[model samples]
Target chain A: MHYQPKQDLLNDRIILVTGASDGIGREAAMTYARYGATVILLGRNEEKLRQVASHINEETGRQPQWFILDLLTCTSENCQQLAQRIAVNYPRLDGVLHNAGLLGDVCPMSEQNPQVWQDVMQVNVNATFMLTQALLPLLLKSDAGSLVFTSSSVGRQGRANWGAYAASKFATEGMMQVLADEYQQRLRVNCINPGGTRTAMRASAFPTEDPQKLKTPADIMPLYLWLMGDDSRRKTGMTFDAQP
Target chain B: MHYQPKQDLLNDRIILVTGASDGIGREAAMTYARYGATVILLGRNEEKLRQVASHINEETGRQPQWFILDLLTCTSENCQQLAQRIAVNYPRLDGVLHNAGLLGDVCPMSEQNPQVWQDVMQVNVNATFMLTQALLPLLLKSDAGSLVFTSSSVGRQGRANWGAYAASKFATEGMMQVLADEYQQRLRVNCINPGGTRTAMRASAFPTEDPQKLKTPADIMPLYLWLMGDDSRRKTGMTFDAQPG
Candidate 1:
């Protein structure tokens, strides 16, 4: 069934979006704020994050709450500490959109450096899990909480030369499945693959492909907004392609 | 298609099977040895490894190589060092059956211990990739090489209480895919899920289930042997279940 985003659907909800400085995450953060959720914009780049926050302040007049997190270098304790801060500030988390990812090299698996692979895993897989686990307590405090893990088509099946990015996404799919199976009765968990989005990563990976032909991050915000809203309470342990 | 075991399918080949001390790994080691391959038994229990090695030696008159590897305690360096040893001794590895796995506590995600989750990932996911990467050069030394990752039905689809084991298996599928795509034109890579096999882990996981009704490890050795041998070398980046999904 096609899910349509409703206005002011998340009026009082509190949501968190990683990779919020740019691309789909930036648009998603803005969209969630527009829907009246107290949005938390998390990213490593403070300068860019401020710009996004300022834009939200201008348009919606309700500036999103922002958190600076470097998923690549953050430890489990760091994630826990951030979660503690979030717990004190937001009290409860209605939804978490794990949109941060690193496309390392996009080279062949044989040629990829071990450090690069580890870095990709650290951000995409390790930090994702650590953050989710750390914040789960706050999420559980909510009457109904939702989590969305960003995955890719390459993750479901292997592709030549996709390297660490593909593998990290695969791990994400697994993590989502594992979490979904464990928490579906209590919370909602899912993976959303925003295929061929006109994002920086897509642009870099496919330099020859015309950006105009691809769906803009804004074009696929409906699914992201829908999953965070109560209309998708029944859905869990499933994967969706936003552009499909 | 149902793959049948062939005579001398692994002749002159050398293959390593993790968790080779007991269960499917042990049985697959013996099965590969029976098909004329020199086996390498890798497990945590060196004593049990010797026992498996002894059996293979008695049956095939070729003493199987044995390695003591505690996946829980081993680091990436350990895997690489072991690969170094394998390189010094064998110079070439025709196939690798990543049959080792950890079935962490069957508990809810909320209840699952972080330590346990980390341990399961270390062995099933981290160590698997480390060892495979370390040994790739050796596998590539051979004209035709193959790698088979042990997977489970729980891995393909997550189930409640399966916990870290299921997640680790999912990682295995992803690893197989990445490696298969990277090396398909040359060396082969695939995943084999021995679904509901009668093993120690099965017994513990399903205490009430009847062991007699479940398929024994030896009963499904055909597919294991098929994947590691050249007969099915064309198959790569696929996950096969011993029983249908």
Candidate 2:
């Protein structure tokens, strides 16, 4: 957590980040560009993505392109088409941060809404898997590619009331492990559990909790930057905590 | 796994076993009934269910009712209606063995078919969760209830080309853990990995392998029986292996 990364850690690298319009995704995008990575932003909202793209352009003089991908209702065909579009522009992608997720109801398993449960699984697991399948070829083109999945504490060990979100995160970890083992020699696949971060998702999950006690997204960017760079290139199929 | 149970260990217990038409689910249903529990059979095919129910009736001299439930297309409403029908005849469900599963295409993640992947998740994870939500009340009525989910080695550590099956099993384990913690004091929730058992599903997954070398479903019933009865009453939130090296 205290690791200090170099300013040019991600220089000349092409990294794609999902959910890059708000919260942790936004901070990670801005922070990566600040450290010299040409980040591609993916999100559903055009305005928010435009704002993020503008900030990245102003800060680092790097114009990051943003794509609109609504993960909730996205299909494999949609992702495949998007991936093809990206392929036409970029030669290869050095990193891919699968950070988009949907937090479903915080109810017990017995009281969980079935529709909401399906929606959560669709966004968190299915869409992410589709995107991974689509972009993996580009990722493999890089000499040292990093595929980072966003995981949660509930993913490793289940917690009551977490419901579909917990199940989806567990699948995320499983998918990451499978890809990690598949491309062990070529690509590095891992997960990051940004624990108790001061984000909008955190606010919604725990509304009554004090937000000041939680670490900001800027505080956890060191591990994010380190994982994207060559410092932790040997790590694969492992889940790292951002706040530890 | 070597633990032995009494002949009448599950006497007076009411248990429901899904996918009881064939494979491990069928073996588990008959094995539980032989141990003295009144088993309810569930499967997608009526003919297969009838054959299994007839066999159970002939062996135990107790008529077991069979219900047709296709997990692939089942929804929460379907499960709730089925639960209502079961509640009408049975006092409570002492055990629920979620033994049904669908093995999607055995291919790498990059080559996985999206439709098949969705079907696997629907049957293995989403449908199972809906059924659990529906039948949980009946399970809680018993003084001791056992909820067991079937898991695989790939579920713990991913394997190449396992694809949707591996992902579904991981979600299954997570669901079991969440329920185990939620009803930790009231009921016992756990998972059983019937490792490389000699079943039709195994045959499909490993077509080139010799089935004679694998353990039969009967061989792994000891762990299943122990988990359902009061023998391993203290064990919960655990994934036990049927074949251990």
Candidate 3:
């Protein structure tokens, strides 16, 4: 059988993506826009965000609205306000992609600085927790909303030198599971480990490794797209990996 | 075949337990002491700590040392100081039981206050991370050391109205997995989900659930003892549920 894309799979849906200024987030925003959903791009860098928005507009004929907010410095109030704004703009949000994260210094747990560890946790773990908390009202408004958090292999199984980053990812996975279990009937929540993807984070974590051996962000979008769409309505509370 | 208490399983080893003032922590501390291992009791309540210490002393004929530190408010500096104290008193530490946790208000996630959520995370997740980080040196000093984290069913699979407590457990499980993978060859780390156990946390989580139907702290000691002792030398980077199924 010949392969065919599901035209209008996400028609009229409103989706929000964090860290949409570059890398996986940027690609995801464009993909969501291409698939017939209006995308909301959220990131700290306004200039980069605008550039990504323009790129999505040019490529997908849909201009993603940009929001400027640094996840590390953003307060819970700000998240609530943004979520309220999203609700005002769209009657109901269909999906949320918590893709932003920090790859804090890689070192032994003994050698790590406390401040650095806290900062990493604030952005990687706390940000996700607080944002999800603030956005739940909007998420619950939809008939069946989806929330996806990006996780890592190290988060599943710790490797030496992964340090605070690994710990933060672990926390994220836990938070995702808790939310997934809680919202089983009302909404679908899940975590995805884009294993060894050729993203900047992976390159930074493994500087000496060959990037050509890894799959690019574009290569892993199928799973992301599948999870956000209606096909995955029956499955929730799972941590999926893009790679086999 | 009959089962006999293994007296020398954890002989001469030093194990530290937090939340030793009451409940599971108290029981675990006394149990470890009874097994020929020296126990260090840590908690905020000095009086309760002393009682636990004295009870262990009377039973084992070896006085357990009590340390008064509120793990919920414990900072990295406090963790460092505790490690230094353990280093000075005992050259090597074999095991640590991260049994301290809080069951914050049972409310829907949308209705939970941010501070309440933060409090639960601090006690259940952050403190455990910091304590393990600070005590790595002491654990590494031994030939084979084990780190055991207490978990719950809500942590592995979430339950409604459990709020941030469930999230904290989930984070704990992930942290255990990561630490286990990181120290697979060097140190052994595992998470034990004491399902339907008779603990205060459980009582708060399931108030209407029958307490008699659940296993007691003493009943689930075999798995805890196994993970903390050399019997589980090959088991690491995994989460085990201590439910009698």
Candidate 4:
């Protein structure tokens, strides 16, 4: 059987994409715009964010507003302020793509720098938790709101030398699962482990491996779009893999 | 088909259990001792700890020592000190059961008290991490050491009113997975979800549910013993369900 993409599934919806400057986040933002959602681009790099926003506008003739929010320095107060701004600017938030993460120094547990581990956890786990908590009020306003947390394969099964990054991903998985169970009936929360994708993170993770053999960020957009859209209302609290 | 309990799985091994004052921890201590293992009891309540120890001693004719250590108040240094004392007393440690946990208040995320959440994380998550980190040297001293973390269904699947307890279990699962992955080649680390067990925690969790329908703490001993013994060496970073068929 032939597969088809549901283009109008997200028509007139407002979706927010974190880490929207580059890589998977950038692709997801553009794709959401293409699917008829007014995208909100959030990231630390303002210039890159603007560039991505322009690309989305030019490609789809739908301009996505840019927000300068660094996940590292994003406190609960900041999140709440941004969420309030979002509530005022947009009628309702249909989905949130938590694609931003950090892959800290990979080292053995005994020899790992504690600061590095803490930094990774702060961005990948703590910030995600704080942001989601802050945005929940606004998210609850929507008729159907979806929260998608970007995950990795190492998060599900641990690998040596991945240290803090692996630990952070595991925590993210747990947090996602908790939210999924709590809001399964009301809202949808899911984690997606984009396995072996051709991105800067993947490059750093496997420096010696061939990037051509892996799937590109755009290749995994189908699942990302599907989850963010109404097609996946029944599926929540699952850890999906983009790679076959 | 009928099932038979495996005999002498943890024979002659030395196991240490924390929070042995009552509940699942107390039952685990006695069950391990019954299976021909030398068990050490640790808890905050000295009298209750001693009572549990004496009961094990009387039942198995093996005296179990009691250690008064409160996991929440105890720091990393205290954990290391306790481990040192254990090392001096018992040359080799075979298994460690981290059964101590705190279930904080049930409320919505917006209405949830942050202090209560922090307290739950401290006892259930941070304590386990610090204890394991401090005891790693001693655990490594043995030929093989098994580490087990008692998890809950709420940890795997969050409920609306679970709040901090659920988050703590989620954190516990994450910590266990990381530890298991890091120590896969060297040590064995696993988490067990003792589903619908007739424990004090279960009673508090499901106040309206019938306790008679749930499995007792002793009923889940087979898998507990299996995980702690040498037979479960291949299993790590896996969560086991202790629900009886």
> Candidate 3, residues A8-52: lDDT per residue as tens digits?
777887888999998889888888888898889999999999999
Across B1-245, the per-residue lDDT of candidate 2 in tens digits comes to 89688999999999999989878998899999999999999889999999999988898888789887898898889999999999999999999999999999898888999889888988899998998899999999999899999999988998888888888888888888899989988999999999998888999999999999999999989999999999878889999998987
Winning candidate number (lDDT):
2
TM-score of predicted structure 1: 0.89
DockQ, per model, reads 0.50, 0.79, 0.48, 0.29
Q: Model 4: which residue pairs collide?
A: none
Docking band of candidate 1: medium
Residues A1-244, model 1: lDDT tens digits: 3556667898999899999999999999998998888899999999999999999898788877788899988877888889988878888999999999998867776566766766787778767877888889988988899999999998788687877677677778878888887786888999999999998898778988888899888888889988998888999988998876
TM-score of each: 0.89, 0.98, 0.91, 0.81
lDDT of each: 0.84, 0.91, 0.81, 0.79
lDDT of 3 by residue, B1-245 (tens): 11245877778889998889767888888888888888988888999899989888988899988776776787999988988887888988799998887788787767777677778878887777888988898999988989999888776666777777876787787678767767878888988887777878778877898899887988777777888777788888778887745
> Best-fitting candidate, measured by TM-score?
2
Model 1 lDDT tens row, B1-245: 36666778889999989999868998999889989998888889988899989988898788898887888777667878999888788979999999888887787766666667667877787677777878888889888898889888876787878876877787778878888878868888988989887889998888899999888998888788888888887888898887763
Query: Which DockQ value does candidate 2 get?
Result: 0.79
lDDT of 4 by residue, B3-30 (tens): 2346676787888898887688988898
Docking class of 3: acceptable
Docking verdict class for candidate 4: acceptable
- Candidate 3 Cα misplacement greater than 4 A, ranges: A1-4, A60-62, B1-3
Q: What DockQ results for candidate 4?
A: 0.29
Which residue runs does candidate 4 get wrong by more than 4 Å?
A1-11, A44-63, A66-78, A108-122, A160-178, A181-185, A210-213, B1-12, B34-36, B41-82, B105-127, B155-186, B210-213, B230-238
How high is the lDDT of residue B80 in model 3? 88
